[PDB]
Design a protein around this ligand. Structure first.
Ligand SMILES: Nc1ncnc2c1ncn2[C@@H]1O[C@H](COP(=O)(O)OP(=O)(O)OP(=O)(O)O)[C@@H](O)[C@H]1O
Ligand SMILES: [Mg+2]
Lengths: 269, 807, 46
């Protein structure tokens, strides 16, 4: 049962994935071995390569060769444009991000033994592509990569709002995963410099800080607007304790200054 | 108006020419003034009958061509509706049907003088038929195999023309005839349909996948320049249809439901037929053994379930101890020892079969069927009808399979599965494995054509005469699905559940019951206890003896059995009246339709009754076009089933009431315009899969009344006599004459052929089917002869005992 | 259709029901031999 729960952790179903992770973390410490999840996962990663755990995280739970491991970027969907096919890839990326953030965040594995090895991984490429192409623009960004010729037309407000909600959940998950990587691994800042934190993450962070509505965060809802400042300040406090302080300071200063406040509040009648 | 005038004038000339050609002496039966007028209108001068006919045909063709030319001028509306396209389609189809009937009447006579005249007719037919189909014509859509068979006889005139003309027809106009197009992808005329086949594959892969799988196991590409191209095209279509192999594993899972002890029996039968016909062949025998052992010998199968896994574990050592590890010993084995080995194996297999009732222990794939992510969506087969443009987004997709599997208590043991679709409803189907269901699909298509014909006749449409049809979807040559009719039971079960305990016990066990008294009478009239009892009884027993015996045997069966069955299932008299009326109407329609198509194996288990509406539903179409009267050892001489129960149900009314009127109206509707039905039946009987070899195994898989394997060594399978007798029936022939012709074709050397035809023809003293001419009968006279032949006690007293003529 | 029993791979008085006990191995979510008895009045339809 715990093997099945582990193998079905990277499935795109949000509630089912949460339940499969909770049941795993509740059933492992009561196995006949009676040990922590870290020790059991370490003892099971030896009889078979870490590629097993990698394909478990990235590869979908429902379909084995159907995760982001078989399609790292959105440029692998041969079908035409469809919100149902964009949201499924978004949910696969979210399921991978949550699995990584839950496993590395609970000290179950090492941040460098699962993401800094020589095995095939598609997490960094996917998150970099998302931050560089989708995380900044509207649904047109996801539409310009599904057979670019003969682009679609205007979308309904619900079709736009569900896409915006999915993108705003994915960006928050990326922020939480980066905060986890920073707060847990003191030397894990190396592998996230290649494509994760160069300019795209800093740009989307300083954009979320100043104008959240430009990314798609709906204002008229308190269930997420009372959590977004928390993850924002946590990511900023994690960056201020890292060598990435300089680029954060540069982006933040070029985004907001005192003269900006002055020219904004000059006329108030 | 000019187009319509030209059309009507050509039609009048065609009618006059056909009337003259059907009765050349009828010209003298008219006044000399009218005959002179006809001679002047014909344009001929030789006064010869053939000259006048040719002149009238020439005038008709000229007028029809002028009408079509006028229709092809200044008639191109952007919004092609059913109003403006009416006259254009009418002209196209009129010219096409004229030239097509000319070509057909030319292909029947060996001596062909009309050669220079009938030169541009094939190309004209093809072009006009395709241009009408482009205008969304149903009459042109239902006559596409006519073009497919015309381009075969006249390739140099129509191959390139059709190849360049069909490229402008919507691909969804061929879904109804996709099985004919995918079947000739290895012939020389394959290029004419490759474009439409590829377009269908690109747009609607679910509507071509099963026919392509059926046709792909019989391709015989030749070693020519065009053969390699056809094989490459077929390979590309196969690679484009094998999207994710979902169809293949679905077919495998459905095949896991079939009983292995019956697949083994079928394999033994076909290798037995292969081991005796020709001097023993090595390659074919080893290929059959490999294809058999791949599913019943290897425990390492992809989708093996516990049901077949137990059979494999129990009978995989015998396939090595008796067979030579791949067929070496089987190849050098003799037919006599092989028979004993197979009989012992079949005994020890049927000793313990125990079909399971849970889907998890017979086919694991369907048990844990889960809709994957970004995978190919499976679809419930049988939803692509060639009527209009299909909407695949509205088609029901398979979302799961129910866990309960119901096994039927028949010989072949079919399985009933319940497929749960994405529409939140259940769809039950009947899984029949090891049986070719293509003939049943073609019969259902013929019934759909008949329903379309009946829907256009006023006398039939005002009474809502429609045959109850179901969807038959063959996937391979040994597996197919059949739509399960909800809340329906067979007629024999309805009759048996109505009898009381004592009545049922008497009918089944008492030695004076009809089932036993009939065999006792056959023994006392023949002296034998085998099939030869009928052969000797047809010679020994006279009319009076068997008539009195049958009238006495009928008396031991409850009279109002069906009436009690109908009053037991109804509450108010309104319900009983409606049930009885619907039963009578549906039974009359089924009888007349099956007589038109020549269905013969109409016993009590081939009729299903809807327990909520009372209608009758025909199933199990194994015999067609007189196949039961021609090839069975005990010939069936009745056109349909009109036994004593059906007569007693209508009391105090007679058979000349509702059933007679329904039969007359249906026959008149079928004979009004039989061109479409005749063309469809001719396409049916000319299928390469409907030869004698397929009929052999079809009869072997049942063994109900057929004699045996090696009894009929000759073929004697006449594909043209079937459609000839069908046209004779639709022309007004006497049913007794058709029955006698079928008897002459089937049992000519039998010692009771004279008695057979004497019983089938009747006597001019009691049965009115010999007091009438052999042709030219009206619909009413034909129905009277049919009811006289189907209720003749002299015929019913000599029927095979499994048909149960007493009830 | 009704469910069919799963095929095997290979190989105290009448009118006496259990009595209502109180021992429960699971604790109720705050928001031993079996004793038998006979059918009372309001147990079965009259
Ligand atoms: N389309 C159908 N819908 C519902 N029930 C069906 C259907 N076809 C067959 N059946 C039921 O399944 C039984 C067996 O099916 P099948 O037609 O394969 O039998 P069979 O070989 O013709 O046997 P028999 O001739 O003895 O009736 C029928 O007697 C009938 O009760
Ligand atoms: Mg039958």
């Amino acid at each position: 049962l715990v093997k099945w729960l582990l193998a079905h952790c990277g499935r795109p179903q949000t509630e089912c994935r949460h339940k499969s992770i909770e049941l795993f973390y509740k059933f492992v410490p009561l196995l006949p071995g009676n040990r922590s999840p870290n020790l059991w996962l370490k003892d099971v990663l030896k009889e078979e390569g870490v590629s097993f755990l990698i394909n478990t995280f990235e590869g979908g739970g429902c379909g084995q060769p159907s995760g982001i491991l078989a399609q790292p970027t959105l440029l692998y969907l041969r079908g035409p444009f469809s919100l149902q096919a964009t949201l499924c890839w978004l949910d696969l990326l979210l399921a991978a991000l949550e699995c990584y953030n839950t496993f590395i965040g609970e000290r179950t594995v090492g941040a460098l033994q699962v993401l800094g090895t020589e095995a095939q991984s598609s997490l960094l490429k996917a998150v970099a592509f998302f931050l560089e192409s989708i995380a900044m623009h509207d649904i047109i960004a996801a539409e310009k990569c599904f057979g670019t010729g003969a682009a679609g037309n205007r979308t309904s407000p619900q079709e736009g709002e569900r896409y915006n909600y999915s993108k705003c959940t994915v960006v928050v998950r990326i922020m939480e995963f980066t905060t986890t990587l920073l707060n847990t691994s003191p030397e894990g800042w190396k592998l996230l410099k290649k494509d994760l934190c160069n300019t795209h993450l800093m740009r989307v962070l300083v954009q979320t800080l100043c104008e959240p509505a430009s990314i798609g965060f709906n204002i008229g809802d308190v269930q997420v607007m009372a959590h977004l400042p928390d993850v924002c300040v946590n990511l900023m406090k994690a960056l201020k304790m890292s060598p990435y302080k300089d680029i954060l300071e540069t982006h933040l200063r070029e985004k907001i200054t005192a003269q900006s406040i002055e020219e904004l509040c000059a006329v108030n009648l | 108006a000019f187009r319509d005038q030209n059309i009507l004038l050509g039609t009048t000339y065609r009618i006059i020419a056909n009337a003259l050609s059907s009765e050349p002496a009828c010209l003298a039966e008219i006044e000399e003034d009218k005959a002179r007028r006809i001679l002047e209108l014909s344009g001929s001068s030789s006064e010869d009958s053939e000259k006048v006919i040719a002149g009238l045909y020439q005038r008709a063709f000229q007028h029809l061509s002028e009408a079509v030319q006028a229709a092809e001028e200044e008639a191109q509306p952007p919004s092609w509706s059913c109003g403006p396209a009416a006259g254009v389609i009418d002209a196209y189809m009129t010219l096409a049907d004229f030239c097509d009937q000319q070509l057909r009447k030319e292909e029947e006579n060996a001596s062909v003088i009309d050669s220079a005249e009938l030169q541009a007719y094939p190309a004209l037919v093809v072009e006009k038929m395709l241009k009408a189909l482009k205008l969304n014509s149903n009459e042109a859509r239902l006559k596409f195999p006519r073009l497919l068979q015309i381009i075969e006889r006249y390739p140099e005139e129509t191959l390139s023309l059709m190849t360049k003309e069909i490229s402008s027809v919507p691909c969804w106009q061929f879904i109804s005839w996709i099985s004919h197009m995918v079947a000739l992808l290895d012939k020389d005329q394959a290029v004419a349909v490759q474009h439409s086949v590829e377009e269908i594959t690109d747009n609607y892969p679910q509507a071509i996948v099963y026919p392509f799988i059926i046709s792909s196991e019989s391709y015989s590409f030749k070693d020519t320049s065009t053969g390699h191209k056809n094989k490459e095209f077929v390979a590309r279509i196969k690679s484009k249809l094998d999207q994710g192999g979902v169809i293949q594993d679905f077919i495998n899972a459905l095949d896991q439901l079939s009983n292995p002890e019956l697949l083994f029996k079928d394999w033994s039968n076909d290798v037995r037929a292969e081991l005796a016909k020709t001097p023993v062949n090595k390659k074919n025998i080893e290929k059959m053994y490999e294809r058999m052992y791949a599913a019943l010998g290897d425990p390492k199968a992809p989708g093996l379930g516990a049901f077949r896994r137990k059979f494999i574990q129990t009978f995989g050592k015998e396939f090595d101890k008796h067979f030579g590890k791949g067929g070496s010993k089987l190849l050098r084995m003799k037919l006599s020892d092989f028979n004993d080995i197979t009989n012992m194996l079949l005994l020890k297999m049927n000793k313990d079969s125990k079909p399971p009732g849970n889907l998890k222990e017979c086919s694991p794939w369907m048990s844990d069927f889960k809709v994957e992510f970004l995978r190919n969506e499976l679809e419930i087969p049988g939803q692509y009808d060639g009527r209009g443009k299909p909407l695949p987004e509205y088609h029901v997709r398979i979302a799961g399979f129910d866990e309960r599997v119901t096994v039927m208590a028949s010989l072949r043991r079919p399985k009933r599965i319940i497929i749960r679709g994405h529409d939140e409803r259940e769809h039950p189907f009947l899984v029949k494995g090891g049986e070719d269901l293509r003939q049943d699909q073609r019969v259902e298509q013929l019934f759909q054509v008949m329903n379309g014909i009946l829907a256009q006749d006023s006398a039939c449409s005002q009474r809502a005469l429609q045959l109850r049809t179901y969807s038959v979807v063959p996937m391979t040559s040994r597996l197919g699905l059949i739509e399960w009719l909800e809340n329906t039971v067979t007629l024999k079960d309805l009759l048996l559940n109505t009898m009381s305990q004592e009545e049922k016990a008497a009918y089944l066990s008492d030695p004076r019951a009809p089932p036993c008294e009939y065999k006792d009478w056959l023994t006392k009239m023949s002296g034998k206890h085998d099939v030869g009892a009928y052969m000797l009884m047809y010679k020994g027993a006279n009319r009076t003896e068997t008539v009195t015996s049958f009238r006495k045997r009928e008396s031991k069966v409850p009279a109002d059995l069906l009436k009690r069955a109908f009053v037991r299932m109804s509450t108010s008299p309104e319900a009983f009246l409606a049930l009885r009326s619907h039963f009578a109407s549906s039974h009359a329609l089924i009888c007349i339709s099956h007589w038109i198509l020549g269905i013969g194996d109409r016993h009590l288990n081939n009729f299903m009754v809807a327990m909520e509406t009372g209608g009758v539903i025909g199933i199990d179409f194994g015999h067609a076009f007189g196949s039961a009267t021609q090839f069975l050892p005990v010939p069936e001489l009745m056109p349909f089933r009109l036994t004593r129960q059906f007569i007693n149900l209508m009391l105090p009314m007679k058979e000349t009431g509702l059933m007679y009127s329904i039969m007359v109206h249906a026959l008149r509707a079928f004979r009004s315009d039989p061109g479409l039905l005749t063309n469809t039946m001719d396409v049916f009987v000319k299928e390469p899969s409907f030869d004698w070899k397929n009929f052999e195994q079809k009869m072997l898989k049942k063994g109900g009344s057929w004699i045996q394997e090696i009894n009929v060594a000759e073929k004697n399978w006449y594909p043209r006599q079937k459609i000839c007798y069908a046209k004779r029936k639709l022309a007004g022939a006497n049913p007794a004459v058709i029955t006698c012709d079928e008897l002459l074709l089937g049992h000519e050397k039998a010692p009771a052929f004279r008695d057979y035809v004497a019983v089938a023809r009747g006597s001019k003293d009691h049965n009115i089917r010999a007091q009438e001419p052999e042709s030219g009968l009206s619909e009413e006279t034909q129905v009277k002869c049919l009811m006289d032949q189907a209720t003749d006690p002299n015929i019913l007293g000599r029927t095979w005992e499994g048909w149960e003529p007493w009830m | 259709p009704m469910f069919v029993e799963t095929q095997a791979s290979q190989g105290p008085v009448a009118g006496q029901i259990r009595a209502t006990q109180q021992q429960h191995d699971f604790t109720l979510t705050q928001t031993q031999v079996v004793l038998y008895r006979s059918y009372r009045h309001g147990d079965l339809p009259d």
